Design a binder for this molecule. Structure first.
Ligand code: ZN
Ligand code: ZN
Ligand code: ZN
Lengths: 48, 131, 226, 81, 171, 56, 55, 222
């Protein structure tokens, strides 16, 4: 899938998907779900 | 029932994990979880409305034969034949008395199975196993 | 049409009469009757208010019963509004019902497991619970009563354990009321479920009225990478 | 199911059914609120018009025989057409 | 129940006991607060074995109070209970809440919900005990009890007993 | 719980997020500050940590 | 008559929160309206459901 | 007999092939139930005598009793040259498992042995039996003479052929895995059409299996 560019606008993150831009606010619960789906080795490489 | 427990009433669709645990005493299907719940703290009665025999947790076994009366006959003839160990050589090749002894042990199995002359046959069983 | 569609409709109807109130029954019966519905059409059919459908739509979205579609079309007067469409995903709905009933029976079996534990003790002044293990260390020099640490008052026996038969009766009285759901899920598992969507649920639509403001034609877009 | 489908008839929602058993067969249109009913005689049919699947505009037209009678049929699902 | 263990104890030796002969002082001050001492880590420690040679390290002078801190490694017999264990004992006290059975240095409580229903309390009898249709359980009476739960604090251990299991109670 | 339009939900969760942030850090770049009844800014935990009269 | 049809679970009825008065009637196509007890209903309300990919 | 039925029913619940001798089966029997070979050796006789003495009007419901008595007597009296095959998929095309048992006779010489023992002069004859010494190997008997005759012709009355390839010289085979080959089926159809164009009176055509005709005539009719 297409990973959007993420920028912060205050206290929330917005992601602009590329146009074959689709910009929308990224909900915190979505990011929490994604971070839960991150495997151990993945964030271990990230330093976590 | 045929698929599902009588107390916890868990079908094989929703909880496929528990096993066919049956009483050797009152002969009632029940799940493994009901045994681990009720009878872990101590012995109790049969949990249904109508049977209340005192049974132990460690006496529970799996059901080999899906029929109940057949399994009852199975367990009583294990319980009887263990002390009834007489062969042809024990009769020194006497076929008629060996056949009569086989008829006698079959008859006492039948009497314990139907439970009609249970007292006298039980007395004879204890007197035989004491010798 | 499809007998499996009738089975899942009967399953959804049974669970909505069972674990839901009358307005949820009306909403789900409207969805199962008119396969694809919008907000204005639902307001026309049910005479429901926005502050009244709010709890309804929130509950059936939280319980994962109605799939919502975010589609905006262009009316000829160019007053385009974000209209919402309500349809049902049969495999997602039956999996949600399966998980809810499994966690219900697991919770109530755990309740029956934990109610076999003895009564324990509880101090009426401080209103703090105590199990059987720490009652021994609260025993006094008289070797009779269990004195509270903070209140210095003898503990009373909590009324838990005598309701174990009540929990068993609750368990049986729940399970004889769920057996048609068990049979419907057995019949579903013995068959195959076709996963539908908005474009597929539009095949069996029933028009609510003659003039619906929300069109039922999907407008594709180019460059969307959701 | 192949003979049944929800349709639009002069900007009015309705359904289309095939009255095939009677000779001649008929395409009956019924308004969903009971406003009006229309049927199509199969003797006066010359050409039958359809829209391609690539087109977003979704229209069906019927050409009759003797000033031909032209009727509009807008549908919701593509397998229906 | 009874184990033997190799334990290491940390002892605050006061500077007043910095005489010529600290070894027997250190062994002694090991020997009051270990004999009969209850620790939830290892149970009731009863007696210290190998008194002739005990491993005494070079002691830590704490940088604030000047006391010597020794890590003495010793071998001793301990009484660490567990749950699921059946033991024998004698009842030392009884009440309507239940009765206390003495198993070694330990007073295991048997709660009133944990006898079979035949036993009942009779406070009119002196001493007040638990009486059933087949047996009576009074003070200083032989009884076999199974422990279903033990709670161990940093310095105290309490246990839960019952006689509901078969082949329990008085022998 | 009671049902709401979605923008009410994002408004409420944005207010909650802002309150969490100013509880945790009142001095945020590009953000308004929570103020006391006297109008002084709310001394967040970061303010109590950093600075001369901070904890360290 | 609508009240006895409601208590027999034959029709679907809409009533005010202020008082029990019918205005709009639908047909009870499914099963019985009162088939699950209130305690089971509320502990069905307490329990949650997993997300999309778990199921 | 009821506990025979329940023992064998228990024996069907298995997920793989069971291939055990009758001795192994009777040992498993005698360790799971208490049932010996000798009472099983009178099973059919006892059941027939009981049915006669009961004088039952109808015997429709007692045919599986014949089945189980036959199984008991057969697997009790016989221990060598026999085998029991218990297998979970009686057809591999079935979605639901249907377990099967097969009690088979490994030694084909057993049923012909008392015929040779009782009678003296024995004539074995087939129009097409080959090889002649193959059958004294499969059946434990000794011949006095075996000879094969070459039938003589003024003109060759029969013309045998071997076709190894189709009209396009593509090799034809009737292996069950390649029964759906369009080239092989098309070659078969071509030769049978040409033969039907050239055969005057009548044909008999033989294939290996019934599902083979079903698939292959479905394909040519298509
Ligand atoms: Zn159960
Ligand atoms: Zn029973
Ligand atoms: Zn208190």
């Amino acid at each position: 899938n297409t990973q959007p560019t993420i920028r912060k606008d205050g206290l929330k993150l917005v992601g602009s998907w590329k146009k074959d831009p689709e910009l929308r606010v990224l909900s915190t619960e979505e990011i929490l779900n994604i971070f839960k789906h991150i495997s151990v080795k993945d964030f271990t490489s990230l330093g976590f | 029932n045929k698929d599902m427990c009588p107390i916890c009433k868990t079908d094989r669709y929703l909880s496929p994990d528990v096993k066919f645990l049956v009483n050797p005493e009152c002969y009632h299907r029940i799940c493994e979880s009901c045994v681990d719940r009720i009878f872990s703290l101590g012995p109790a009665q049969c949990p249904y409305k109508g049977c209340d025999k005192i049974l132990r947790k460690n006496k529970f076994k799996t059901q080999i034969f899906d029929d109940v009366e057949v399994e009852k006959e199975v367990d009583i003839r294990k319980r009887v034949f263990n002390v009834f160990n007489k062969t042809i050589d024990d009769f020194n090749g006497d076929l008629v008395e060996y056949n009569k002894y086989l008829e006698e042990v079959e008859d006492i199995i039948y009497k314990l199975d139907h439970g009609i002359d249970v007292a006298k046959t039980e007395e004879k069983l204890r007197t035989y196993e004491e010798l | 049409d499809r007998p499996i569609d009738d089975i899942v409709k009967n399953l959804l109807k049974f669970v909505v009469r069972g674990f839901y109130g009358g307005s949820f029954v009306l909403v789900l019966d409207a969805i199962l009757f008119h396969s694809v519905l919008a907000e204005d059409d639902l307001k026309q059919l049910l005479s429901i208010n926005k502050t009244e459908l709010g709890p309804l739509i929130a509950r059936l979205r939280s319980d994962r019963l109605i799939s919502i579609h975010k589609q905006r079309e262009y009316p000829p007067n160019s007053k385009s509004v974000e209209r919402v469409y309500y349809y049902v995903k049969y495999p997602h709905a039956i999996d949600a019902i399966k998980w809810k009933v499994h966690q219900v029976v697991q919770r109530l079996k755990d309740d029956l497991d934990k109610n076999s534990e003895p009564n324990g003790y509880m101090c009426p002044i401080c209103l703090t619970k105590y199990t059987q293990l720490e009652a021994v260390q609260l025993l006094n020099f008289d070797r009779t009563e269990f004195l509270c640490s903070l209140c210095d008052e003898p503990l009373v026996e909590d009324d838990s354990g005598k309701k174990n038969k009540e929990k068993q009766d609750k368990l049986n009285r729940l399970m004889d009321q769920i057996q048609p759901i068990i049979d419907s899920l057995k019949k579903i598992d013995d068959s195959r479920i076709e996963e539908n969507t908005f474009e597929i649920a539009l095949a069996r639509l029933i028009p609510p009225q003659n003039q619906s403001h929300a069109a039922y034609t999907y407008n594709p877009k180019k460059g969307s990478t959701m | 199911m192949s003979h049944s489908g929800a349709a639009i008839f002069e900007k009015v929602s309705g359904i289309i059914a095939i009255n095939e058993d009677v000779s001649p067969a008929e395409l009956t249109w019924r308004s969903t609120d009971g406003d009006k009913v229309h049927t199509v005689v199969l003797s006066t049919i010359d050409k039958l018009q359809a829209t391609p699947a690539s087109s977003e505009k979704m229209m069906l037209r019927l050409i009759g025989k003797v000033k031909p009678q032209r009727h509009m049929f807008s549908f919701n699902n593509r397998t229906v057409m | 129940m009874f184990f033997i263990k190799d334990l290491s104890l940390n002892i605050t030796l006061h500077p007043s006991f910095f005489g010529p002969r600290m070894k027997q002082y250190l062994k002694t001050k090991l020997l009051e607060e270990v004999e009969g001492s209850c620790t939830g880590k290892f149970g009731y420690i009863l007696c210290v074995l190998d008194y002739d040679n005990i491993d005494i390290q070079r002691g830590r002078i704490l940088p604030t109070d000047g006391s010597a801190e020794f890590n003495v490694k010793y071998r001793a017999v301990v009484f660490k209970p567990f749950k699921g264990e059946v033991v024998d004992g004698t009842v030392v006290s009884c009440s309507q809440h239940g009765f206390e059975v003495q198993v070694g240095p330990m007073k295991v409580f048997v709660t009133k919900h944990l006898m079979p229903q035949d036993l009942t309390f009779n406070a009119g009898s002196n001493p007040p005990s638990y009486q059933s249709s087949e047996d009576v359980i009074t003070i200083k009476s032989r009884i076999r009890v199974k422990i279903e739960g033990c709670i161990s604090q940093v310095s105290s251990i309490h246990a839960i007993g019952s006689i509901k299991e078969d082949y329990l109670g008085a022998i | 719980h009671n049902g709401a339009p979605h923008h009410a939900i994002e408004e409420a969760e944005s207010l909650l997020q802002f309150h969490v942030a100013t509880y945790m850090d009142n001095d945020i770049a590009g953000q308004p500050q929570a103020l006391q009844k006297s109008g002084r800014p709310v001394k967040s935990i970061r303010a109590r940590l950093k600075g001369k009269e901070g904890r360290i | 008559t609508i009240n006895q049809l409601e208590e027999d679970s034959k029709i679907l009825v809409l009533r005010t929160k202020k008082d029990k008065t019918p205005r709009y009637v639908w047909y009870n196509s499914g099963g019985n309206l009162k088939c699950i007890d209130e305690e089971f209903v509320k502990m069905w309300e307490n329990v949650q459901l997993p997300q999309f990919a778990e199921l | 007999l009821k506990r025979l039925i329940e023992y064998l029913k228990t024996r069907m619940k298995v997920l793989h092939v069971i291939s055990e001798t009758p001795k192994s089966f009777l040992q498993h029997l005698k360790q799971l139930t208490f049932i010996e070979r000798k009472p099983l050796r009178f099973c059919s006789e006892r059941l027939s005598l009981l049915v006669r003495t009961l004088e039952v009007t109808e015997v429709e419901d007692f045919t599986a009793l014949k089945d189980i008595a036959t199984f008991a007597t057969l697997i009790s009296t016989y221990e060598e040259g026999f085998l029991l095959i218990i297998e979970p998929y009686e057809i591999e095309n079935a979605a639901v498992p249907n377990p099967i048992m097969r009690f088979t006779c490994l030694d084909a010489s057993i049923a012909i042995k008392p015929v040779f023992e009782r009678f003296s002069s024995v004539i074995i004859t087939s129009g097409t039996i080959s090889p002649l010494d193959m059958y004294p190997r499969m059946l434990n008997f000794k011949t006095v003479l075996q000879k094969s005759y070459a039938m003589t012709l003024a003109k060759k009355s029969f013309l045998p052929m071997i076709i190894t390839k189709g009209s396009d010289q593509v090799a034809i085979s009737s292996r069950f895995e390649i029964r759906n080959d369009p080239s092989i089926v098309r070659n078969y159809g071509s030769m049978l059409v040409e033969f039907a164009k050239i055969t005057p009176d009548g044909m008999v055509v033989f294939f290996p299996s019934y599902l083979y005709m079903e698939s292959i005539v479905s394909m040519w009719q298509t």
